Design a protein around this ligand. Structure first.
Ligand SMILES: Nc1ncnc2c1ncn2[C@@H]1O[C@H](COP(=O)(O)OP(=O)(O)OP(=O)(O)O)[C@@H](O)[C@H]1O
Ligand SMILES: Nc1ncnc2c1ncn2[C@@H]1O[C@H](COP(=O)(O)OP(=O)(O)OP(=O)(O)O)[C@@H](O)[C@H]1O
Ligand SMILES: Nc1ncnc2c1ncn2[C@@H]1O[C@H](COP(=O)(O)OP(=O)(O)OP(=O)(O)O)[C@@H](O)[C@H]1O
Ligand SMILES: Nc1ncnc2c1ncn2[C@@H]1O[C@H](COP(=O)(O)OP(=O)(O)OP(=O)(O)O)[C@@H](O)[C@H]1O
Ligand SMILES: [Cl-]
Ligand SMILES: [Cl-]
Ligand SMILES: [Mg+2]
Ligand SMILES: [Mg+2]
Ligand SMILES: [Mg+2]
Ligand SMILES: [Mg+2]
Lengths: 245, 268, 245, 245, 268, 245
């Protein structure tokens, strides 16, 4: 049989680094929405990295550094976004916790308080996989590995777009980009072209044991995260190919 | 003025007592690493520029460590300015911004350290700095992250939430604490000018100046900002600093050889 | 505008190291008073260093050590006082937490339990400022920096004297020392002579953003801390020169 | 007078490593019984090491290593048993905590959640006492030192046998082994022959200040731990020779 | 008596089984640092006395490390006695006092380490002691804090709450664990006397004595207290210790050269 | 099979009305001991009636009133003792609750706070059984019916004597009264003579489904209630004749 669920009542929410990059205009409404969710759900809130990881990639690549050097440098920027977001929720009892604490003491921390913030990047450090010069296991991938390992009730990915489109809706081909309300990870993995989620996310969804669907929603629209955490369809659903027990 | 008299004041008076303060000032003065030089490699002015700036300085560091003992600290730069901008726009205080900046200086130290690792030079840190003595003895150099450890206890500036003590101050205070013989700031301009040289010309170059003369000249902004200059006037061990252009090939080497490249800023 | 308050509901209480130096005769009544305050306030209790830091200053100065060496040696003694006080409150759910934890995870710890104990010294380590051979940023100063950074509801300084006098009431000139019920930090900073608080406290009060007044009270008189935490005037009020929002 | 009790309301439960070695068949019933005890008691659950420490002793002794090398290697195996048991209780808010955290922050952790798991071995590391090539201060001994230092309400030792017998009931002389419902530590210390508890446990019981009796019970029989925590006599009682206050 | 027979007992018997205990005792005996010497620098007897005691010993350490590999542990002293007095008066148990004392020995190690840093000698610690091998290989010395790591798991004495295993025991056990060749306690008296020499005369000096003879003589208090002497009788590797006066110029140097200064205390 | 346990983690403590009758001299130490038990156990504290019920019996019998009139009049006095005891524990979050609330909402009240106080008399009102002119179902009987119906972990009866003796140790034959450390309800039910517990208690023990033993202890000796709640033998054990499951 499949492994047991460690924290079946947990909801995991990954906040894109580029949402944080928009500053107070995006963060204050989002903090207000999270504040109102604390009495409704037990939350592990994980932040991605955003534009500063692009800058440190630019420097590190110009210096010739390998992918196992660049992975922890990007993970640092996700940690900083997490410290910023937790500071805004400190008065609700929310703090940022580091990787060792997430790995080993999350249960006691979620007994102490309604939500904790962590980094969405995984601690792959100098053991990141080779092949691309860009670290593959980034924030979407780390958050999904954790959510599925815990057997959490869900994972919601909060982005600066409505969901997945057939082309980058901020890119060159933005004119023929059409919105996908629902897709499967295997269908996405067979496509070429950019996505709003890591390609390694699709690979770890193929080996997942618990999480059946992940919704990508626009955190710049107040209320969509709240609706997604209740299962309402307001962005793109990604079916993982986990089959029900 | 005895050791017994100092010990008696230390037991009987407040540490605020001017008589105690003065007896403590007559204490002996031990320099922990008197033969070492502290160098700061700029974050925005050097490491953010990538290979064309960093690789020649790595070569100079490797050549220098044969005759010189180096403590090499890193600046933070453009990713810290980004973090400060986000955090300040949310209303977060200087003590929260201080921790964000340290993470960027740590990134830069890890990148520089990886280019130096095959020469045996380590990156060191932690509240004890405990890897410094053995590293300096054996390979004559160590890399450290330049932000001070003040975190939430950072003193704010008089206005705004940008931490006033950043990597210039952090490197300076370590030179002062270890009693080092020399402090060299490696940036991207030849030294101090009467204006700052990126935004105006007939700015005139200044080879040597005291902190009081900088203030009296009204030299504002400038390649070193005032919090570190005030620390310099209070310092016990490091009473002048040198600012040099690390983009000029061999400038760091020549400064370590005692050549007067750049600007020398004196406490008095 | 001024920065937001991170923990506006917090009360910070700094316990002088010389109160702890009196041993059980002073500590037991104080522990009993703290026990009764736990259901009334959310407390960050920070201990100073006291006489053992004078001894390590005596040794370190005789060895010639610089001020950045002496600062962490004194901070160690404040940490030990904190471990002693927390041990006495362990049965109420109170533990001592270290600097990294105070800096980053205080909110979750104050959600877990009613009070935590920490060191009042700041982690300036080998980066203490030069000028005096005595470390300037000590327990009063560290506790105020933290309280103001958090935007706490107050900071109360618990000493072995009634408050500030015009001269040391235990010193040579004790005969002309007169009690000051209220003063301003700027007035104190212009005086010469010893104080019961760090001189650097007056400097950080000049740059403070939230805390308008700090009361110094005698923790050897049961009930004064309780009264001070309710705003009652029972020692010396220090006005910081923060103006109301 | 004797020292104060730090955590007088605490119950400490040591789980033998060889109970864990039996796998799911023993662990699942035990986890279910612990789950039902969480609303009744405040628990510090400490795991021993079991057979893997015998294997690392075999390797380390073949390599010639001294007793201060073998002690932390065995303590590692007790830590792993603790991580396994806490994972099974994660959904109840239970996590494993390490030695520094047990030593200094247990009170706040037991305020956050009903139970925590730790290692029963003490952190003697390379400072284990010489004399035997087998580390003397093992899981029973570490758990008793902690329980007595805290002044806990009890310590219950959960084993794979009913209690202490006059000979190893799984060994060569198992035919003449007779069950001892009650004994004193001093009587046990005067006997030669193997015991189900460390011999150093008897030594630290002689210097104990609070714990008057320790019960050894069979954790393979559902309900015995529950009964022991209520003071019911269902295994072997060991009287420590602490006299009531 | 085979390796297979030991492994079979280790799987089938309790570790309390006398047959297992005896097979384990026949195991081979590897010494981890057989060429090193452990020295304890006294806290109350040396470091608390300041420069007049410490500076000559720093000079001796620097001279010794040319021919000798040294692990240098620190005592705690008068600040720990103060902490013990406060804590014992509150009724706190030995396990709480043990952590307080370690902080004082750590302070003393940091002060000694800062005087040695320019010679490359580091301060080391943590549960792994992982900085010891490289430091000893390269600069032939390391400084460590002398308290054992037992913390709340400290075994109490039969009476009272003062931790019985303090920095003498901590240093001794590290010498025993590493299989070092020599253990030297550096204090402030010439060695053992029939009385203790600070509080009575016609105390007679004792150059060499066994632990059993010390007990039979009823030698109480004494410059080493009984918990470490009992560890000595159980030890596998370090079967005698030397106690010397570190206030006498060159006594440590001479002890490291094999001169019989001080008192030698033998396990049997 | 026997009925399920509704509140298996509950400890029930019945406080004799004559303990309360001693006033502050007995009540203050007892309140201090209860205060220290709140972090260790989940308590239902039930008070008996004491001397005022004797007075209202005297009046009601002189007026000719039947046993169904006298039962609620005595139950009123137990309620008043409960209000007094709860007032003393109000600052710990403890209140008195009435019969309907005990019958139907105890679980939520014990989730809100560590202990509640109620009346030990049952609500038999005008439906008390006939036969004696003295109401038979009094405080010991009501407390046992509730404890056994809940399937509680225990019931401890706190009296002004050490336990049960062979004769009233305050009565005429006090010279030949010898202490009984342990007895069975059936043995007690066959004796004639007064007891410190209701005779109807013995009858409801014969039909009990869960509680195997009840200890009677002297609440005038500090520490005995604490010890009894841990199963230590410090008064008289009454075996009910429930056999283990
Ligand atoms: N097919 C697609 N559909 C939707 N967005 C796409 C697609 N291809 C590219 N994108 C881009 O992905 C962007 C999100 O950038 P990215 O996903 O790296 O940010 P993030 O998730 O916030 O960063 P991090 O991964 O560090 O958390 C969108 O704004 C969009 O322009
Ligand atoms: N003007 C003054 N008014 C009041 N007290 C003064 C004054 N000047 C000196 N003092 C002294 O300050 C003493 C307090 O000493 P100190 O303030 O260092 O102790 P503490 O605050 O307990 O120590 P720590 O700063 O480590 O917590 C008082 O007992 C008093 O003798
Ligand atoms: N006199 C005795 N009475 C009872 N058991 C004994 C006795 N002598 C030896 N034993 C053995 O002790 C065994 C328990 O082994 P051990 O006690 O080391 O396991 P454990 O306590 O689970 O391990 P750990 O100490 O790592 O937690 C029992 O199964 C039994 O065979
Ligand atoms: N055999 C006996 N052993 C012990 N006490 C007895 C015995 N027979 C009578 N008594 C008396 O019972 C007394 C207790 O009186 P009672 O039991 O009615 O008080 P209570 O239980 O406090 O009242 P309530 O039942 O209203 O709570 C004891 O003080 C004692 O004198
Ligand atoms: Cl190179
Ligand atoms: Cl020197
Ligand atoms: Mg994305
Ligand atoms: Mg003071
Ligand atoms: Mg065992
Ligand atoms: Mg009665």
């Amino acid at each position: 049989k499949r492994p047991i669920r460690l924290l079946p009542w947990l909801q995991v929410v990954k906040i894109g680094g580029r949402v944080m990059d928009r500053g107070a205009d995006a963060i204050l409404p989002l903090v207000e929405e999270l504040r109102k969710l604390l009495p409704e759900h037990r939350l592990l809130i994980l932040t991605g990295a955003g534009v500063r990881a692009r800058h440190v990639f630019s420097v590190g690549l110009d210096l010739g550094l390998p992918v196992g050097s660049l992975a922890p440098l990007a993970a640092s920027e996700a940690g900083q976004n997490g410290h910023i977001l937790a500071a805004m929720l400190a008065s609700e009892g929310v703090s940022y916790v580091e990787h060792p604490t997430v790995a080993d003491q999350l249960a006691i921390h979620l007994s102490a308080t309604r939500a904790v913030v962590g980094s969405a990047f995984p601690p792959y450090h100098h053991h990141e996989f080779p092949g691309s010069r860009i670290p593959p296991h980034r924030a979407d991938t780390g958050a999904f590995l954790l959510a599925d390992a815990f057997g959490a009730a869900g994972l919601t990915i909060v982005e600066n777009v409505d969901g997945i489109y057939t082309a980058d809706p901020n890119g060159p081909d933005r004119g023929q980009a059409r919105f996908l309300p629902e897709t499967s990870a295997t269908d996405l993995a067979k496509s070429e072209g950019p996505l709003p989620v890591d390609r390694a996310l699709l690979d770890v969804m193929a080996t997942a044991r618990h999480i059946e669907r992940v919704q990508v929603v626009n955190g710049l629209v107040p209320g969509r995260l709240t609706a997604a955490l209740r299962g309402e369809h307001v962005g793109t659903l990604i079916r993982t190919g986990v089959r029900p027990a | 003025n005895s050791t017994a008299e100092l010990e008696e004041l230390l037991m009987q008076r407040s540490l605020t007592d001017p008589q105690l303060q003065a007896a403590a000032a007559a204490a002996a003065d031990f320099r922990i690493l008197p033969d070492a030089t502290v160098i700061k490699i700029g974050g925005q002015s050097v490491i953010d520029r990538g290979r064309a700036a960093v690789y020649p300085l790595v070569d100079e560091i490797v050549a220098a460590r044969k005759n010189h003992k180096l403590l090499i600290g890193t600046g933070a730069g453009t990713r810290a300015r980004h973090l400060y901008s986000i955090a300040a726009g949310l209303g977060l205080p200087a003590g929260v911004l201080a921790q964000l900046g340290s993470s960027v200086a740590d990134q830069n130290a890890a990148m520089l350290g990886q280019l130096l690792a095959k020469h045996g030079i380590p990156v060191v840190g932690g509240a004890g700095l405990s890897a410094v003595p053995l590293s300096l003895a054996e390979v004559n150099a160590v890399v450290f992250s330049g932000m001070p450890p003040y975190k939430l206890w950072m003193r704010p500036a008089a206005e705004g939430v940008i931490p006033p003590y950043r990597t210039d101050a952090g490197c300076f205070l370590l030179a002062e604490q270890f009693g080092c013989k020399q402090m060299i700031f490696v940036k991207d301009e030849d030294g101090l000018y009467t204006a700052n040289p990126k935004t105006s010309k007939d700015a005139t170059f200044i080879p040597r100046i005291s902190v009081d003369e900088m203030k009296a000249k009204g030299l504002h902004d400038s390649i070193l900002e005032f919090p570190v200059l005030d620390l310099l006037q209070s310092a016990q061990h490091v009473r002048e600093v040198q600012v040099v252009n690390g983009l000029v090939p061999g400038n760091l080497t020549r400064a370590l050889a005692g050549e007067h490249v750049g600007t020398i800023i004196t406490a008095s």
